[PDB]
């Protein structure tokens, strides 16, 4: 006998203690002209979808450190309205250069942050506040600071001075702060269909609904970008008849949760309390929830956390259902193997071929970044990537073979061509192979029917930041300048590829987490994004012992290898990032959308057994043999990525009349193509760590362009 909140609650009291009766259609809950708000970017066709350029952001990560954001709006939905802030104006410029979508890390009702202001303390506030809220701090190695008139932020910078692998004092205090902070990613669902209240100015009542909507209007109208909501239907924060956060398991016990076949214990494969999307009423809950975010919140797309735990049939059912409210809605998620195939056909990368549901591709990710997740110790240095200089510029610990390096080129190329199962290419050995025939750790590399089913990335909230990975993987020889270009080169593989471009907020500012792997509860300190551009937050302390202690020896070996970026380097990287996105939006040839278009137009050079390492050369046809003239200005495209310390030569386009992109020519000395030579005789000289978009201008009519080998079909 207990009182439970509604699983279908649409409004709540502070800390979700009581559900509230609400009418989301009320003008009172709408910012002015909400009813006439439209999606700034189209999502109707595969070609519309392929244009998608995602920036995965977090509410605190955006405004927690930005001083130009009024104090009371920092770490709030309303922060996006601070038109005159470093953060808002930064997003405004990124949007203008080609970032199309904003992905929001958990903004539904999370369980893991106390919504009562006075039961919480952040680093911005005095150390005394920390001790008042946190009992543990009063009985720890920092108890002495409760007496000091200094803030937690202050004390943290003081601890840096003597922070080392043998004395990890910065992270020790942070661990304690993290229990009473306002910082969590939020992958802990309390209520699926209510916004989080801690990101609101007042969490008591409906205030959150108008504020969230206000943020949506700002993103779409004032920043001119679509919205993607990160969703977590795979688990609930808790189950059982006692947990405060158990809602679903208190109402229909043993129904909503996935239980072990023998013991009836709630399974925890996802972490936490495994939900059962395979059961009819929970599948209904998921669909009804998405309906609300779709029409009442005007969300453009959804990213499903651990989507492999859901039955493919459920995802498709929800999708058809949501399409009736918004026909141009996009669904994508993490389609990794969940090990639920004994129970149902899982919503995996493989199983979703041709469904329309997109999945994150780990193939290009791992090839460009180097190694894979779960890498620990010296493997974090040993497993270099195309972008860390695997093969071309090895580090002292590296032992990667020529074939091993060539195979990463094979996986990267396949990814750049939208990771398709049927795309034919010339492998590391000179064999003609379908994408599905190229291995990826025992799995078929290519798996998709259309590039719109693939999301390429080299950085995300989870795992090491791109910069941190380069810091672990780059040769002692790679100076700050080459490592900045290494970041850009890594990003070019995503930005200039047929698949959907996704990236972590901050990659344009060489974002660092000072080697933190799982920054979910590493607070404002480690997850800091400086929008005033003074630094990338690198070397700000040893990361969490619990999860990164096993990597301290590797961190010390690499940490001091190169200088920390400053205003100049961050500005250099932003310029490069804006270049790449501008390029992506510069031709319909970059975003073909249809798998058949990719196969009829996309091909690669510098392929085979004899290939030059680090040189990625992609050709896109707009010539007569491809079909219709897609770009009225071009006949074809060339993407050249020289991820090598030696400058390279391109004699492939013998006598072809090419020109560097106007986008890159305008950039000049600040271009990634700075120094690219195009000889009258069609020979291209590519400088080290450079990216060039060579374009084939169209004459007075569609000529023959860059026709594909047409070596195989199907």
């Amino acid at each position: 006998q207990y009182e439970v909140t509604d699983p279908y609650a649409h409004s709540l009291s502070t800390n979700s203690e009581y559900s509230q009766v609400v009418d989301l259609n009320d003008s009172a809950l709408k910012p002015d002209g909400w009813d006439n708000l439209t999606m700034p970017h189209a999502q109707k066709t595969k070609a519309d979808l392929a244009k998608m350029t995602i920036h995965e952001s977090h509410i605190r990560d955006l405004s927690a450190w930005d001083q130009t954001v009024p104090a009371e709006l920092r770490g709030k939905y309303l922060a996006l309205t601070a038109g005159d802030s470093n953060m808002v104006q930064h997003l405004k410029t990124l949007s203008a250069s080609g970032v199309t979508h904003v992905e929001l890390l958990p903004v539904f009702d999370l369980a893991t942050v106390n919504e009562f202001s006075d039961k919480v303390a952040d680093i911005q506030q005095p150390f005394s506040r920390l001790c008042e809220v946190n009992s543990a701090v009063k009985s720890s190695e920092f108890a002495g600071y409760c007496d000091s008139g200094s803030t937690v932020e202050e004390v943290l910078n003081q601890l840096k001075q003597s922070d080392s692998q043998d004395n990890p004092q910065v992270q020790a205090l942070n661990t304690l702060v993290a229990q009473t902070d306002s910082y969590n990613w939020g992958y802990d669902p309390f209520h699926y269909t209510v916004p989080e209240g801690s990101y609101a100015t007042d969490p008591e009542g409906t205030t959150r609904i108008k504020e969230f909507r206000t943020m949506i209007q700002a993103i779409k109208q004032d920043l001119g970008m679509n919205v993607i909501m990160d969703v977590v239907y795979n688990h609930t924060n808790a189950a059982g008849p006692t947990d405060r956060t158990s809602v679903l398991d208190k109402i229909v016990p043993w129904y909503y949760q996935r239980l072990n076949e023998t013991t009836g214990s709630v399974e925890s494969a996802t972490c936490c309390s495994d939900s059962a999307p395979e059961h009819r009423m929970f599948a209904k809950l998921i669909a009804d929830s998405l309906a609300v975010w779709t029409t009442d919140y005007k969300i453009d797309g959804f990213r499903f956390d651990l989507m492999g735990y859901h039955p493919k049939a459920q995802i498709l059912s929800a999708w058809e259902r949501i399409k009736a409210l918004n026909p141009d809605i996009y669904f994508f998620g993490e389609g990794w193997d969940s090990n639920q195939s004994d129970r149902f056909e899982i919503a995996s990368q493989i199983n979703l071929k041709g469904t329309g549901i997109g999945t994150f591709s780990d193939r290009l990710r791992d090839s460009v970044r180097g190694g894979g997740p779960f890498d620990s110790g010296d493997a974090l240095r040993q497993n270099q990537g195309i972008g860390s200089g695997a093969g071309v510029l090895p580090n002292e610990l590296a032992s990667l073979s020529d074939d091993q390096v060539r195979h990463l080129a094979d996986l990267t190329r396949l990814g750049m061509a939208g990771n398709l199962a049927d795309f034919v290419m010339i492998d590391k050995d000179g064999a003609a192979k379908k994408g599905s025939e190229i291995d990826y750790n025992g799995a078929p590399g290519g798996y998709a029917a259309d590039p719109t089913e693939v999301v390429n990335y080299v950085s995300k909230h989870d795992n090491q930041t791109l910069w941190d990975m380069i810091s672990y993987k780059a040769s002692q020889e790679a100076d700050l300048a080459t490592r900045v270009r290494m970041q850009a080169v890594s990003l070019a593989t995503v930005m200039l590829g047929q698949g959907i471009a996704f990236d972590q907020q901050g990659s344009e500012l060489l974002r660092s987490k000072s080697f933190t792997r799982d920054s979910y509860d590493s607070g404002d300190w480690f997850n800091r994004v400086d929008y005033s551009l003074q630094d990338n937050n690198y070397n700000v302390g040893m990361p969490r012992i619990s999860d990164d202690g096993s990597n301290y020896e590797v961190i010390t070996r690499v940490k001091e290898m190169v200088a920390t970026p400053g205003e100049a380097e961050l500005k250099q990287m932003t310029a490069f990032y804006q270049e790449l996105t501008e390029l992506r939006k510069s031709s319909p040839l970059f975003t073909l959308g249809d798998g058949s278009a990719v196969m009829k137009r996309v091909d690669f050079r510098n392929t085979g057994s004899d290939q030059q390492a680090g040189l990625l050369v992609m050709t896109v046809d707009d010539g007569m043999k491809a079909g219709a003239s897609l770009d009225s200005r071009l006949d074809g495209l060339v993407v050249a990525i020289n991820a090598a310390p030696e400058s390279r030569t391109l004699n492939e386009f013998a006598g072809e009349t090419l020109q560097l992109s106007a986008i890159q020519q305008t950039a000049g000395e600040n271009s990634l193509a700075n120094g690219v030579q195009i000889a009258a005789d069609g020979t291209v000289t590519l400088p080290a760590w450079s990216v060039a978009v060579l374009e084939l201008p169209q004459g007075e009519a569609q000529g023959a362009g860059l026709p594909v080998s047409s070596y195989y079909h199907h």
Binding site: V424, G430, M624, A654, Y712
Partner: protein, 341 residues
């Protein structure tokens, strides 16, 4: 019945890079790579010679009977010759031979200002020069050039199919004839049989009289074949592709339709009783008259009637059409783009 398939061989990577004051020519041996057996490249030689045009050679043999210029080495893909040079600038005259017989029809002229690397590749009877062994191999094992000639309803002329065990006419109405993910030629085909050039044909096409003649089956539906793509394929006894080429069909178009077509009137023939629109398009899949206003807005779109004897398309409309603008909306396979335009 044998399936035509690609050879299970990786794409080649030069094997030899041309160094200072010396060029390298690769012979991409098709017969050599289709064979799991080793080849004797002794018979292979280059007749090299200096002239007013291409004089960059160093010590070229004068004697035409001199077969001494044998390969400077070999591998699976074929032989190669490391040719010594006088100057790294200019060009050289190469005649690729197997004894005292030209392998490449045309006299090659290797312009070093066209191939910066001086590492070049050639295929027998190809006339073309490639910068790579790969570029050559791809060309060799692809539908390439338009070597075959459908000269009459029954006859297909092709020197490439001469003495070959498998000679076929592959076709596809709405797609290109190609090799699948397994490297097989699955598209519909017709079996060709060796024949002799007709007296009537020799008259019409004296420039092809020497070309190898092939008889098409009697069941062949000439009309529907000309509706789309046709490709001439030559293969081994085992079905490994030797050659795949596009087909030149003007000869058959004259032989199948011209007699009837010649007896008709063309254009937008406005006479008493209205206006007859007639266009000859014997290969077109569809033809429509599109009628436009003075503002060039569509006033009518009329699908035309095809006369099978002639391949002419017609459409009759009122005398009201006097002064109307029009164009024919075509649906036709173009061999240059290999698509149904």
């Amino acid at each position: 019945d044998v399936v035509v398939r690609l050879p299970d061989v990786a794409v080649p990577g030069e094997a030899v890079t041309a160094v200072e004051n010396q060029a390298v020519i690769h012979l991409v041996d098709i017969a050599g790579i289709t064979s799991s057996s080793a080849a004797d490249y002794s018979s292979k030689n280059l007749y090299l010679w200096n002239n007013e045009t291409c004089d960059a050679l160093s010590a070229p043999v004068a004697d035409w009977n001199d077969v001494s210029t044998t390969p400077s080495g070999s591998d699976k893909y074929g032989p190669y010759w490391v040719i010594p040079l006088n100057k790294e600038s200019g060009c050289i005259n190469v005649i690729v031979r197997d004894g005292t017989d030209k392998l490449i029809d045309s006299d090659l002229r290797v312009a070093f200002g066209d191939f910066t690397d001086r590492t070049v590749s050639v295929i027998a009877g190809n006339s073309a020069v490639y910068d790579s062994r790969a570029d050559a191999f791809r060309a060799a094992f692809g539908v390439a050039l338009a070597e075959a000639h459908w000269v009459d309803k029954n006859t297909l002329l092709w020197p490439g199919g001469q003495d070959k065990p498998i000679v076929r006419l592959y076709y596809s109405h709405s797609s290109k004839v190609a090799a699948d993910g397994e490297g097989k030629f699955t598209d519909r085909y017709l079996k060709l049989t060796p024949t002799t050039v007709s007296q009537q044909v020799s008259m019409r096409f004296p420039h092809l009289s020497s070309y190898a003649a092939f008889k098409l089956p009697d069941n062949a539906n000439v009309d529907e074949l000309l509706q789309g793509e046709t490709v001439a394929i030559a293969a081994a006894e085992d079905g490994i592709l030797i050659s795949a080429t596009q087909v030149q069909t003007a000869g058959v178009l004259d032989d199948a339709y011209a007699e009837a077509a010649e007896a008709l009137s063309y254009g937008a023939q406005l006479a008493d009783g209205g206006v007859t629109f007639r266009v000859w398009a014997p290969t077109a899949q569809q033809v429509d008259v599109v009628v436009y206003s003075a503002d060039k807005k569509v006033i009518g779109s009329h699908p035309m009637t095809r006369d099978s004897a002639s391949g002419a398309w017609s459409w009759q409309g009122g005398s009201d059409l006097k002064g109307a603008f029009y164009r024919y909306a075509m649906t036709v396979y173009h061999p240059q783009s290999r698509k149904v335009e």
